[model samples]
Target: DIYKAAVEQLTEEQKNEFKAAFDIFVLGAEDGCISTKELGKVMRMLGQNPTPEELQEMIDEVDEDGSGTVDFDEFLVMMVRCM
Candidate 1:
């Protein structure tokens, strides 16, 4: 629901752009799950090569189900909040 709200606030173009980036982030993942290593790559793409601690902290903040990985909905919330 939070992710839904966040996405609803985006313009069409922003949504499209986010979807494109999300696809890249989850490239090797099945069912849209992103592992910590995948997230590290995404962070690097965003210009920050985060340390493991930093990465874990980021995941903790957005990992709603405590699954130790981010799914598309969680990622969307995290991305929208950052923006």
Candidate 2:
């Protein structure tokens, strides 16, 4: 039940795509929850390489419940917002 609402806006098909993206971006993490440092790679993959503090700021914005890790639930919320 934790953060299921994150994807409430996503259609079932989109949710599948979201997970596929997550799995690739979350490469360094085995437990599904991603580390901020690992996620920084995504920032570089998207734009200029960012600083750790900047990456931390990203986490501060994304982790809705402050679970202290990057995961599908939080990213889904931001994903839907951006979409």
Candidate 3:
């Protein structure tokens, strides 16, 4: 499910652009990441954010590992799910 859903929704071309844009959310992670602060801003990048109230809830859902940041694949699924 981790990948199957995304494979259905995001084309590899979109995947490339997602990788490109993900850099905008990156805060100097050598491995790349989206911090809690930028998540809201990234939400602004699209209208997918339902409301201000659920920001932390979104983080909790995507940051499933409790890593406290959104990884690229995690961001992909969450963004696709929310969108």
Question: TM-scores, in order shown?
Answer: 0.52, 0.46, 0.45
Give the Å shift of residue 4 in candidate 3: 32
| Candidate 3, poorest ten consecutive residues by summed lDDT | 44-53
Model 2 Cα shift for residue 9 (angstroms): 36
Error of 2 at 81 (Å): 4.5
lDDT of 3: 0.66
Writing each residue's lDDT as its tens digit, candidate 3 over 1-83 gives 87888657986776665665566556434557766556665554443553545766776787878887777787787788787
Off by over 4 Å in 2: 1-24, 42-48, 81-83
Q: After superposition on all CA atoms, how large is the RMSD of candidate 2?
A: 10.2
lDDT of 2 by residue, 1-83 (tens): 64687569667777676666566575766677766777666555544465888666766788876787767787666567557
lDDT against true structure, model 2: 0.67
Ranking by TM-score: 1, 2, 3
Clashes per prediction? 0, 0, 0
RMSD of each: 8.2, 10.2, 8.0
TM-score preference between candidates 1 and 2, better one = 1
